Amino acid sequence: LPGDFGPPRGEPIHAVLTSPPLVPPPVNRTYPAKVIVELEVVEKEMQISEGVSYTFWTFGGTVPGSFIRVRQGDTVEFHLKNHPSSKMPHNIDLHGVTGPGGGAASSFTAPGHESQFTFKALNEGIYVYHCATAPVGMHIANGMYGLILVEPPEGLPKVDHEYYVMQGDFYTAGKYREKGLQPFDMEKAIDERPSYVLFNGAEGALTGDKALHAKVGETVRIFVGNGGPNLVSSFHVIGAIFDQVRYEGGTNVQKNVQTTLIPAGGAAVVKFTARVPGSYVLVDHSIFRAFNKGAMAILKIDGAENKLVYSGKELDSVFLGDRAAPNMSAVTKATQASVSGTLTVQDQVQAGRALFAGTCSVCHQGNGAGLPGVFPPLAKSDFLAADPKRAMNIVLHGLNGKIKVNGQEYDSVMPPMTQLNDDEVANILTYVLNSWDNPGGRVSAEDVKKVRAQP
Amino acid sequence: LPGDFGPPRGEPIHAVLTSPPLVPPPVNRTYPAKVIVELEVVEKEMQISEGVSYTFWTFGGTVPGSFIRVRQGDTVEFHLKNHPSSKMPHNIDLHGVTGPGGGAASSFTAPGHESQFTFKALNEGIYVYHCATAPVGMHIANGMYGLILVEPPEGLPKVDHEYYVMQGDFYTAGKYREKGLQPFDMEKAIDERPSYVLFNGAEGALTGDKALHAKVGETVRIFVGNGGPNLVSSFHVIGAIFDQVRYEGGTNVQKNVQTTLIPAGGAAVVKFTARVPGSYVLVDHSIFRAFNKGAMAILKIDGAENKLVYSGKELDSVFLGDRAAPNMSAVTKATQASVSGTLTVQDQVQAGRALFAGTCSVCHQGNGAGLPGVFPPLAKSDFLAADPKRAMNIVLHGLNGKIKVNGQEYDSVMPPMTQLNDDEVANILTYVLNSWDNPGGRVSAEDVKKVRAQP
Amino acid sequence: LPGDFGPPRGEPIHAVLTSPPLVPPPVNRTYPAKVIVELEVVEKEMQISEGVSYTFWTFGGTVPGSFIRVRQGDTVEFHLKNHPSSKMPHNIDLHGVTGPGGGAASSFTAPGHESQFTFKALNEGIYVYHCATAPVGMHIANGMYGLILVEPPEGLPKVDHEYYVMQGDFYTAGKYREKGLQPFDMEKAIDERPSYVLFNGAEGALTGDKALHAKVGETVRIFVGNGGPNLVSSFHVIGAIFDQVRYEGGTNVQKNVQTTLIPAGGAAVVKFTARVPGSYVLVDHSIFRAFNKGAMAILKIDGAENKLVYSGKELDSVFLGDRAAPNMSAVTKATQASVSGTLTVQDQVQAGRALFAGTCSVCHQGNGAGLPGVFPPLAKSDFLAADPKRAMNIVLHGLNGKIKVNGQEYDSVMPPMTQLNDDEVANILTYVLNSWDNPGGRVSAEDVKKVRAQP
Numbered sequence A, B, C: 001l002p003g004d005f006g007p008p009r010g011e012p013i014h015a016v017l018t019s020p021p022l023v024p025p026p027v028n029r030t031y032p033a034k035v036i037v038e039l040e041v042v043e044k045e046m047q048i049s050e051g052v053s054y055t056f057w058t059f060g061g062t063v064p065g066s067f068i069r070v071r072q073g074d075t076v077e078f079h080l081k082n083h084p085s086s087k088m089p090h091n092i093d094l095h096g097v098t099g100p101g102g103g104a105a106s107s108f109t110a111p112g113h114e115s116q117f118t119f120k121a122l123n124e125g126i127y128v129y130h131c132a133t134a135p136v137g138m139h140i141a142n143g144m145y146g147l148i149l150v151e152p153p154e155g156l157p158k159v160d161h162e163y164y165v166m167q168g169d170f171y172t173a174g175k176y177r178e179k180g181l182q183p184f185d186m187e188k189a190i191d192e193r194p195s196y197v198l199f200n201g202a203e204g205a206l207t208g209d210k211a212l213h214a215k216v217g218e219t220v221r222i223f224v225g226n227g228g229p230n231l232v233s234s235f236h237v238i239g240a241i242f243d244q245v246r247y248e249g250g251t252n253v254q255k256n257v258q259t260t261l262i263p264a265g266g267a268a269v270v271k272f273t274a275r276v277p278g279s280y281v282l283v284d285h286s287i288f289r290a291f292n293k294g295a296m297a298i299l300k301i302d303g304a305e306n307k308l309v310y311s312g313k314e315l316d317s318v319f320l321g322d323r324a325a326p327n328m329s330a331v332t333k334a335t336q337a338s339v340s341g342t343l344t345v346q347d348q349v350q351a352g353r354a355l356f357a358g359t360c361s362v363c364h365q366g367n368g369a370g371l372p373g374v375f376p377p378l379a380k381s382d383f384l385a386a387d388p389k390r391a392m393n394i395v396l397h398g399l400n401g402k403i404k405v406n407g408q409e410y411d412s413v414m415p416p417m418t419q420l421n422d423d424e425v426a427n428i429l430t431y432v433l434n435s436w437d438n439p440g441g442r443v444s445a446e447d448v449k450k451v452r453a454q455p
């Protein structure tokens, strides 16, 4: 059989698993070993977006699950534990396993139990693993997926950085950025109409202060998985090119491409060389996913500018919107304060500040000045101050036709922004009212709910 | 021109066409021939799922249509007959034909008529053929697609088994597994929201007793088509790897991959070597298709276990759900008995038995015992017996919070199963009531319809 | 760095940009140059379909935007102007640019302004460029995408014809072919449910008298982009095969394929050799896109028939429906006349004539004769004449069961055609009534609206 290099030798190895976005060290070994993998399923609430909770089902407490790294020809003794706090039974199917269910029938594990099975890793490559418990789509949609790397016997070529990025489509009862604990929505899942499309299980998991890092001149390998359950990723890096893309354990290697399709349940190894400094965006280039559902991750490159290659500026909020900033923690704080009934004006102002970036600043500017005659000012705006209820209607339903703001005529079009949630409109307008010599006061989520109910 | 090896020689050959999942023998020929292909369009009702009828439009009486096998450089004389019972006109477009419409303008055929056209098979490869009659999407959605293989002149490498598997997306007015004759739904088709995603034109067409077969050590070639009309298949084999994947007549061959994207209207040849015994599942890994819409097929491998490669068990209903069993004929029988007005308790019990597998057994076990303190028993359940109407509400709408069953406390969550149809809930609960010393009696589809109407 | 061949030499070149479907001449140069690209954003109403207006946002006044052609190693000085009539700010991200945002942060341009940035073209290949202004999906959905070709240093192999074809998905408030100025629909865009899927920004942009042309024996290169924003194209040529397909700047080249997947934001170079005369259809083979949403383009090959290769007829309206004809200008004229309140019977008749092709003629024939006993006549039809209101109901809601037409019995099924708009049903039936010795008169859109409101 391929990838059979004899029985295990040396000592049994306890696999060291890593949490995303990090990868275990290269196995750096010339002999086949018995590798003991211990993975524990944990069901738990986590933030899928600021102020939005979701009950994830996880391998190892993360989405995606712990990264497993072995060598082709290793005997893997796989232990799956199901934490006693679990409500569901779980199991595992690893791609790249040779045998029925990729482990599923022998890994069936009730809450508080443990199962084990053994397999030889015959197939080199990068592989998705996932839960295989009826209803299979529900388990995978709740975050039950990760990657296993089966190294070639000589190891992969040395790089400066290895990272772990996995896309998933998620199905909430509520709309995108609707606050609260969001249940799983089976109807959206069956229709393949996700509310979120994420890297590593949350909006902003790999942006701002959670960006991946490297330096000019360094090489980066990324193990990229698509857990699905349903979407195919038009996986793309903005402002850069992949030196190589290799799918699973495939013989074919594509070189010098920027855009590549990753099947549902598929995995690829990509390699990048950093040439110039700045933020490189990993996206699903089915563009409403990347810019309206959360499918964006950042690789931040530090080092010397090369004006002969690129004369231009670092990414800002015009392109990355509200993810240009280090974090949106102010949104989480305002949401918690609403729940507790302690929401202050300043809690709203700081949340609105975070959300104004891109969403409003692209036209009205970061300082609210606009552009005289083209985009009207929000800074010390007589039109804003004259009618705060009309301002709520303008955000939700748009504005067009001739208006006068601060003594100048505008005759343009502000598109409707009906996709903003009531708390988002309230916090943004509270921010604007409390900035730039505007009159202060506040807009409440209830205020906006009433305007939404009758335009 | 490529693939032109002179005029036809020998005798004219009458092509021998096969029904899925079988393929005609290798042409085994060193000379170009005149090949006469006779294909007849038949419109007819068939079971798309147990107790669910659909009017298919077929090439040769099957979905997918009869497999056509010729050699590169053959002159093909193509005869399309439209059966007199047909209501629609039909035609054909074969991929791999060199000429406008791939045959469409010269194959236009009214009910009870016959058309013919001739083409040289210049392009080697595996190709989709399909109907090309306005409205083209409706004809293809009704099952009007198949494969034509144009062998290379030296033939393909010898294998132990060749099979024919074709994916299709289907659009019923009714929901998944809603019983009766289901009309085509143009609105779902335009929106690309299929009710079924199938291999070979039915749920269970290639599962249980209709599985594909081979033995350990044997090689299997599968000609895989995607008739669409609309979906792209994340085509995957669970627990195995493809030795080779080749698309259409492409020069590129990918090797050692498990997951591959097949375009709408695309076709690939895959090759598999059986290493260990068990059931290998072919799926569209857009996972709600495979596990909620019917997109699963089985290759069953017989032979000696190899514990050094895989220590684990054969696939069961935890992963394959209600398709683990040889067939679900009891569902078809119960549906026919409802139509006739002769439905008995035992008809319901046998249907419920089939549907309980996976759907309920994953948590409550095949014997209804559950797991004390974790999953409550359905076997001799005081809680079930106390309130059969509450049991209908629990299946449709779920259950959570503290309950007492057979003297033990449970504090867990049973998800809602609202996607089950009224007859399915009725038959499952009738099965449970008539098993395991439960009190007997029955639940009717009308009973469940009323509970669904007011939770 | 790759593709760095020293500083620019010779004179600065002012790039000559072309409108689709044409491409600039090969750069035909042995030295790296400074290339000055000037591109202007124009927002403007254009016909997305006959009688259907849309406000496109364009690079250079077209969808897709002006084609840019440079050589690997050129220094590109990129000037983006935003026309003063613009309401939105715009920018650019070019795939294949090495640097953050592919130009986005340094190309931010308010109406009536100009921005510039410089980049070295290190990466050879074909690349999408698009707007990168929040909300990014809205800008791309409004048509803000095109192609840039970075030639290899020795140039591409010489061909007879080069063309420029780019797919896009579009999101109108109204349904497909609903007349009037159609606003952008953010809700459809987020759900990835386009109303139109087009080549080069309109239905019929590359059909009939706007077809691409070549002659038997000639080679055609097509630069194929997928602007998205959301869809993946199952890109296919009907009745022909691609000699080569190469994605972006990839090392891999696939040969001899008919069907290939182009990611959202992806681009490919395809090469075709014309073997026999006729119309070759480029489609997205997600078939409801091609035949129900506009995703069809034609390459028309003139020259000598080769009966040894293909004995069959040129494409007609059975396959291409209402796009078989040179244009559907009569629909545009009837729509304008309705708006003006000058709609005549003959305006309706000429519009109906155009729309009857395929839609009705596939069964009732181009002359309305039908096929005795199989498809009833519309020519001098007693059944039509007896009840014009019943004819409106038959088009919208279908007909089945026994009928008598012109003294012969029919017992067949005419499917419902509810997707036709009220003006389309009115114009088709006015055409039929005024043809073939039928009694004349007219059906109005208001007539059909009332029948639609109560079947």
Ligand code: HEC
Pocket (backbone or CB within 6 Å): A359, A360, A361, A362, A363, A364, A374, A375, A376, A377, A378, A381, A383, A384, A391, A394, A395, A399, A400, A401, A402, A403, A405, A410, A411, A412, A413, A414, A415, A417, A428, A429, A432, C088
């Ligand atoms: C450009 C695409 C804009 C974005 C994004 C947002 N706004 Fe806007 N806004 C814009 C225009 C062109 C106009 C004038 C419309 C016209 O009829 O000419 C406006 C107007 C407003 C107003 C009222 C006028 C004023 O006080 O300056 C308000 C209060 C306003 N806009 C607020 C606002 C907020 C809060 C935004 C993000 C949520 C936002 N706008 C986005 C253009 C654009």
Ligand code: HEC
Pocket (backbone or CB within 6 Å): A088, B359, B360, B361, B362, B363, B364, B374, B375, B376, B377, B378, B381, B383, B384, B391, B394, B395, B399, B400, B401, B402, B403, B405, B410, B411, B412, B413, B414, B415, B417, B428, B429, B432
């Ligand atoms: C796990 C994912 C389950 C599946 C699949 C099904 N059921 Fe279930 N069921 C489950 C739990 C954890 C509970 C207890 C909930 C709580 O509040 O603690 C239940 C409960 C029931 C009951 C009532 C209690 C009893 O009689 O044991 C019934 C009647 C029941 N479940 C039926 C049932 C059927 C018929 C199923 C398939 C259609 C099914 N359940 C699936 C967990 C799970």
Ligand code: HEC
Pocket (backbone or CB within 6 Å): B088, C359, C360, C361, C362, C363, C364, C374, C375, C376, C377, C378, C381, C383, C384, C391, C394, C395, C399, C400, C401, C402, C403, C405, C410, C411, C412, C413, C414, C415, C417, C428, C429, C432
């Ligand atoms: C085949 C797929 C058809 C298409 C496309 C259209 N029509 Fe049709 N039509 C068809 C049949 C088989 C029948 C008879 C149905 C039966 O019960 O046997 C009809 C009937 C009509 C009629 C009434 C009878 C007559 O006058 O001949 C009308 C007025 C009619 N059809 C019109 C019509 C138009 C305008 C179409 C395009 C919009 C059209 N039909 C499409 C079969 C088919």
Ligand SMILES: [Cu+2]
Pocket (backbone or CB within 6 Å): A057, A088, A089, A090, A091, A131, A132, A133, A139, A144
């Ligand atoms: Cu699980």
Ligand SMILES: [Cu+2]
Pocket (backbone or CB within 6 Å): A093, A095, A128, A130, A265, B285
């Ligand atoms: Cu899988």
Ligand SMILES: [Cu+2]
Pocket (backbone or CB within 6 Å): B057, B088, B089, B090, B091, B131, B132, B133, B139, B144
């Ligand atoms: Cu047909």
Ligand SMILES: [Cu+2]
Pocket (backbone or CB within 6 Å): B093, B095, B128, B130, B265, C285
């Ligand atoms: Cu086709």
Ligand SMILES: [Cu+2]
Pocket (backbone or CB within 6 Å): C057, C088, C089, C090, C091, C131, C132, C133, C139, C144
């Ligand atoms: Cu723009």
Ligand SMILES: [Cu+2]
Pocket (backbone or CB within 6 Å): A285, C093, C095, C128, C130, C265
């Ligand atoms: Cu892009």
